[PDB]
Design an enzyme around this catalytic site. Sequence first.
Site, mmCIF file in Angstrom:
data_model
loop_
_atom_site.group_PDB
_atom_site.id
_atom_site.type_symbol
_atom_site.label_atom_id
_atom_site.label_comp_id
_atom_site.label_asym_id
_atom_site.label_seq_id
_atom_site.Cartn_x
_atom_site.Cartn_y
_atom_site.Cartn_z
ATOM 1 N N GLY A 1 6.993 0.917 -2.369
ATOM 2 C CA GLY A 1 6.983 1.420 -3.725
ATOM 3 C C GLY A 1 5.836 2.400 -3.786
ATOM 4 O O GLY A 1 5.802 3.359 -2.999
ATOM 5 N N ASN A 2 4.899 2.159 -4.702
ATOM 6 C CA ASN A 2 3.721 3.017 -4.870
ATOM 7 C C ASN A 2 4.040 4.508 -4.891
ATOM 8 O O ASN A 2 4.043 5.134 -5.950
ATOM 9 C CB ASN A 2 2.700 2.735 -3.759
ATOM 10 C CG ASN A 2 2.646 1.253 -3.381
ATOM 11 O OD1 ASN A 2 2.801 0.373 -4.243
ATOM 12 N ND2 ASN A 2 2.416 0.968 -2.091
ATOM 13 N N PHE A 3 4.314 5.070 -3.721
ATOM 14 C CA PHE A 3 4.610 6.498 -3.575
ATOM 15 C C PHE A 3 3.280 7.214 -3.332
ATOM 16 O O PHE A 3 3.096 8.373 -3.731
ATOM 17 C CB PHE A 3 5.292 7.066 -4.836
ATOM 18 C CG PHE A 3 5.843 8.467 -4.659
ATOM 19 C CD1 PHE A 3 6.908 8.715 -3.786
ATOM 20 C CD2 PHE A 3 5.286 9.538 -5.359
ATOM 21 C CE1 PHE A 3 7.406 10.022 -3.615
ATOM 22 C CE2 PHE A 3 5.772 10.835 -5.195
ATOM 23 C CZ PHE A 3 6.832 11.080 -4.324
ATOM 24 N N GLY A 4 2.358 6.503 -2.681
ATOM 25 C CA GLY A 4 1.057 7.060 -2.367
ATOM 26 C C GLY A 4 -0.048 6.452 -3.204
ATOM 27 O O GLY A 4 -1.230 6.738 -2.994
ATOM 28 N N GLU A 5 0.335 5.598 -4.148
ATOM 29 C CA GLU A 5 -0.604 4.965 -5.063
ATOM 30 C C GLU A 5 -1.488 3.866 -4.455
ATOM 31 O O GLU A 5 -2.539 3.554 -4.992
ATOM 32 C CB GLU A 5 0.174 4.450 -6.274
ATOM 33 C CG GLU A 5 -0.664 3.746 -7.320
ATOM 34 C CD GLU A 5 -1.196 2.420 -6.813
ATOM 35 O OE1 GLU A 5 -0.407 1.579 -6.323
ATOM 36 O OE2 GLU A 5 -2.420 2.236 -6.897
ATOM 37 N N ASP B 1 2.518 -9.184 -17.235
ATOM 38 C CA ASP B 1 3.220 -8.557 -16.124
ATOM 39 C C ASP B 1 3.545 -9.540 -14.993
ATOM 40 O O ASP B 1 3.383 -9.233 -13.815
ATOM 41 C CB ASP B 1 2.406 -7.382 -15.579
ATOM 42 C CG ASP B 1 3.278 -6.347 -14.903
ATOM 43 O OD1 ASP B 1 4.491 -6.310 -15.206
ATOM 44 O OD2 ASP B 1 2.754 -5.564 -14.080
ATOM 45 N N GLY C 1 1.985 -0.768 1.804
ATOM 46 C CA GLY C 1 2.888 -1.399 0.859
ATOM 47 C C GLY C 1 4.168 -0.613 0.590
ATOM 48 O O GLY C 1 4.365 0.487 1.123
HETATM 49 C C1 LIG Z 1 -6.624 -6.491 -4.906
HETATM 50 O O1 LIG Z 1 -5.575 -5.691 -4.851
HETATM 51 C C2 LIG Z 1 -4.754 -5.622 -3.808
HETATM 52 C C3 LIG Z 1 -5.225 -6.153 -2.539
HETATM 53 N N1 LIG Z 1 -4.585 -6.156 -1.444
HETATM 54 C C4 LIG Z 1 -3.274 -5.571 -1.481
HETATM 55 C C5 LIG Z 1 -2.518 -5.564 -0.276
HETATM 56 C C6 LIG Z 1 -3.041 -6.347 0.821
HETATM 57 N N2 LIG Z 1 -2.345 -6.513 1.978
HETATM 58 C C7 LIG Z 1 -1.086 -5.915 2.159
HETATM 59 C C8 LIG Z 1 -0.392 -6.071 3.319
HETATM 60 C C9 LIG Z 1 0.939 -5.381 3.558
HETATM 61 C C10 LIG Z 1 1.499 -4.495 2.488
HETATM 62 C C11 LIG Z 1 0.755 -4.327 1.186
HETATM 63 C C12 LIG Z 1 -0.489 -5.016 1.029
HETATM 64 C C13 LIG Z 1 -1.239 -4.898 -0.157
HETATM 65 N N3 LIG Z 1 -2.660 -5.018 -2.604
HETATM 66 C C14 LIG Z 1 -3.422 -5.032 -3.830
HETATM 67 C C15 LIG Z 1 -2.740 -4.400 -5.047
HETATM 68 C C16 LIG Z 1 -3.241 -4.271 -6.288
HETATM 69 C C17 LIG Z 1 -2.241 -3.651 -6.960
HETATM 70 C C18 LIG Z 1 -1.218 -3.460 -6.045
HETATM 71 N N4 LIG Z 1 -1.498 -3.925 -4.836
HETATM 72 C C19 LIG Z 1 0.094 -2.768 -6.365
HETATM 73 C C20 LIG Z 1 0.156 -2.298 -7.858
HETATM 74 N N5 LIG Z 1 -1.003 -2.660 -8.625
HETATM 75 C C21 LIG Z 1 -2.121 -3.254 -8.282
HETATM 76 O O2 LIG Z 1 -3.013 -3.451 -9.113
#
Ligand SMILES: COc1cnc(-c2cnc3ccccc3c2)nc1-c1cc2c([nH]1)CCNC2=O
Length: 302
Positions: free
Chosen positions: A20-24, A130, A18
Amino acid sequence: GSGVLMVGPNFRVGKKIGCGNFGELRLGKNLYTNEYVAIKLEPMKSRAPQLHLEYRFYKQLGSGDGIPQVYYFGPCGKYNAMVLELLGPSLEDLFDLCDRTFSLKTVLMIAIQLISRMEYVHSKNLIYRDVKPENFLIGRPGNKTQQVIHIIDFGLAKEYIDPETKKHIPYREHKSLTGTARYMSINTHLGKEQSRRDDLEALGHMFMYFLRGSLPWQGLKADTLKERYQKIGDTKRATPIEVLCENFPEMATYLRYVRRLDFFEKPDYDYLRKLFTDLFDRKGYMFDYEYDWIGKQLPTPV
Ligand SMILES: COc1cnc(-c2cnc3ccccc3c2)nc1-c1cc2c([nH]1)CCNC2=O
């Protein structure tokens, strides 16, 4: 020793995924099931912890339609980690892919699902707070939920029904502004406690953002977040719904309905869904999950 990060007994921690995050956020694999998962990490050293009770909010939510499944919450090195179901790209990623504008049929299929999504959250005594394209994700290619719009990141969530008293939280003001300005309700801008209506109004702003390509307060900048917030709020109050929702009568009806909701009021989700399904049916659309992004090529971390 091994040099490999594990979360819990079976989750291997993978690459950073993903933007942003920065490793999160990292990709992960359940070694026992041979399945990929998403792993949210939060330094144990965090000044503003959210992970653990976000986890609790998910517990509270339970297994639900459009709610990613949570598998684990535990320590990982100097990180607290939450393992959950891997999903696909966000509505924002998809928006860009579709040249920053969605067709009304796509927006209505999205809106109809999200009203239900939010009603579900609300039925669990939680208000989201949010709303934004980035927190709504489609499922993945095959795991048969790819066309389901999911809701993620419940870090800003709040229980609007006191668990003991069973009363709606009290009205109050002077709440500091933190959420994302572009979609937030006008009352949120005024420093008022957020409630059900606010999640619904934020969705409205987002629906119009998708339909128009942009919102009229979108490019506002200032010398302090507070000021920016204040300018955006001023413009939202200064843009008439009929002008913002020009060409989309139902959207204007949706928007001024939620804008006029009382602080404690339960929204009439059936009424709002119907505004959109009646429109949907009248335009001759078929709810077949064929969004504008269907047929385009999506980003897959795996
Ligand atoms: C069930 O949570 C999640 C399930 N899958 C994904 C995913 C899947 N395919 C992807 C494909 C390409 C690039 C990124 C991806 C992210 N991201 C998340 C998720 C939860 C959260 C976040 N991302 C960011 C901040 N806060 C959150 O709570």
